[PDB]
């Protein structure tokens, strides 16, 4: 489904996406929108960190969810 994911700025920005893809697909689409790599891509959500493996629907996110969309602090 569409969530609202904000930025390290505090800004607004929506993802339409399906409870059936995953966060990587998810956040693959912000890639392709905004432009940022899933890699880099450091989203939180509960306090845990939103897992590729891991579905919107498995994490049972309700319509226009709150989640927080912030970069990797270190590398590897």
Do not use: C, W
Not at 19 to 27: A, C, L, M, Q, W
């Amino acid at each position: 489904m569409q969530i609202f994911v904000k930025t390290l700025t505090g800004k607004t920005i929506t993802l339409e996406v399906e409870p059936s893809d995953t966060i990587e697909n998810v956040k693959a689409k912000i890639q392709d929108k905004e432009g940022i790599p899933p890699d880099q891509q450091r989203l939180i959500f509960a306090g845990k960190q939103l897992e590729d493996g891991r579905t919107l629907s498995d994490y049972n996110i309700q319509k226009e969810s709150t989640l927080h969309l912030v970069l990797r602090l270190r590398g590897g």
